[PDB]
Amino acid sequence: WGQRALQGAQAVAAAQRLVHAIAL
Amino acid sequence: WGQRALQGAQAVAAAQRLVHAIAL
Amino acid sequence: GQRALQGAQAVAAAQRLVHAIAL
Amino acid sequence: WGQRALQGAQAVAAAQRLVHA
Amino acid sequence: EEQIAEFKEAFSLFDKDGDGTITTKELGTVMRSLGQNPTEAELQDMINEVDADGNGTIDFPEFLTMMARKSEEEIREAFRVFDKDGNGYISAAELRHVMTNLGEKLTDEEVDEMIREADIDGDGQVNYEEFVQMMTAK
Amino acid sequence: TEEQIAEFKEAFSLFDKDGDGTITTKELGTVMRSLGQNPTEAELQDMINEVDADGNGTIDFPEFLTMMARKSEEEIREAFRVFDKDGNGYISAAELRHVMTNLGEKLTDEEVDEMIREADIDGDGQVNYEEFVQMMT
Ligand SMILES: [Ca+2]
Ligand SMILES: [Ca+2]
Ligand SMILES: [Ca+2]
Ligand SMILES: [Ca+2]
Ligand SMILES: [Ca+2]
Ligand SMILES: [Ca+2]
């Protein structure tokens, strides 16, 4: 599946878990 | 302890995971 | 690599369990 | 008291993970 | 519903015999595989907390209700943030530094009091387990 | 790392049921059985042989530490959650195609279907959470 796609999806989630934690 | 500190601490790790995952 | 993963699968669940039961 | 139960449960997820992959 | 399928796989770890209910010694054998060795008394009040009918055992519907209470490793991540030297203990010095980073204008007494709020063993620092106890406290 | 060897001795003790210092093939079997898996003696042997640096058949504490050093299991759950948009627990070729296109991947329908049937073990046409970590390893 290739490293760039696996780590990119993880980076998106990371941005997500960031905005969510920043909510509180 | 304050939700302010607990959620801030999770947001730091998420920014971290963010930078580390952005690195690929 | 099938039985192998199915192990790490159930653990993820056992900790979500002993979390709620335990707390 | 029992949160040490989920600590070990947490560690077992990692140990299992690399005991085969 | 997909969630129920995952919870049926989860209940099966506790329900070794498969009778439909989680007995006290079944909670004990699983706890013991995780190194924790609680007394029969401790297993009983742990079940009694999530025993709606008080039958002594936890059936699948009761178990489902408990899982619906409510990511469980978010605390592992937060602790790793607070515990700077990675020694596994949050000193009052480390907490002070982390609060200042998040802008908390907390005095030395306030920081020591937070340490004492989460220090169960009284070692002066908050280990992981003490942190998890404080994070997962209703 | 110096205070980390603590947390690995707590993890190792979980498997070394007798405390002899090594995790025998049957001790892994008993921990695996506590996790619902009932693997064969043959499957347990090739599992130890992988992390058996000396080939003596058992894992002493130093081999265990070396194995633990290698690597990211809970971050995989996050990545799967990203690919599975509809939250049905299965990654469709459509879900994968959109996630690839979002990330700038110029992958054709065949490249996407090949990624699907590549992680497709049971032939569900979809990349299950299990099927996903099986290829993630
Ligand atoms: Ca039972
Ligand atoms: Ca009941
Ligand atoms: Ca510290
Ligand atoms: Ca302490
Ligand atoms: Ca042994
Ligand atoms: Ca050895």
Task: Please name the residue of chain F whose CA is at the shortest distance from the CA of residue A12.
Answer: F82
What are F2-6's contacts with CB under 8 Å, separation 24+?
Answer: F3/E86, F3/E87, F3/E88, F4/E86, F5/F65, F6/E88
Q: Could you give the CA distance from residue E136 to residue F66 in angstroms, rounded to a whole number?
A: 33
CA dihedral (E83, E86, E89, E95) in degrees, to 10, reads -20
Q: Do B10 and E80 touch (CB under 8 A)?
A: no
Resolution in angstroms comes to 3.9
Core vs surface per residue E40-63: b (16+ CB within 10 A) or e: eebbeebbeebbeeeeebbbbebb
How far from chain centre, in Å, is Cα C13?
A: 3
Backbone angles phi, psi at E26, to 5 degrees: -75, -35
In degrees, rounded to 5, the angle at the alpha carbon of residue E137 between the alpha carbons of residues E33 and E88 is 60
Q: What are phi and psi of E22, to 5 degrees?
A: -95, 105
Question: Which residues does residue F91 pair with via DSSP β-bridges, in sequence order?
Answer: F127
Q: What is the number of alpha carbons within 13 Å of residue A16 lying toward its C-beta? A: 11
Token pair listed for F41 = 């003696």
CA atoms within 13 A on the CB side of E73: 21
Taking Cα atoms as reference points, which of F98, C18, F94 lies closest to residue E132? C18
Tell me the fold of F3-70. Recoverin; domain 1 (1.10.238)
Classify domain E1-69 at the CATH topology level: Recoverin; domain 1 (1.10.238)
Interface chains of chain F (3 or more CB pairs under 8 Å): A, C, D, E
State yes or no: chains E and F have 3 or more CB pairs below 8 A.
Answer: yes
Ligand 2 centroid to Cα of residue F131, in Å, is 35
Tally of residues, chain A: 24
D10 contacts E76? CB cut-off 8 A: yes
The C-alpha atoms of residue F62 and residue F74 are separated, in whole angstroms, by 24
Q: How far is the CA of F53 from the centre of ligand 6 (A)?
A: 7
- Cα E69 to Cα C20, D2, D3, F9, F75: the distances in Å are 8, 18, 17, 33, 24
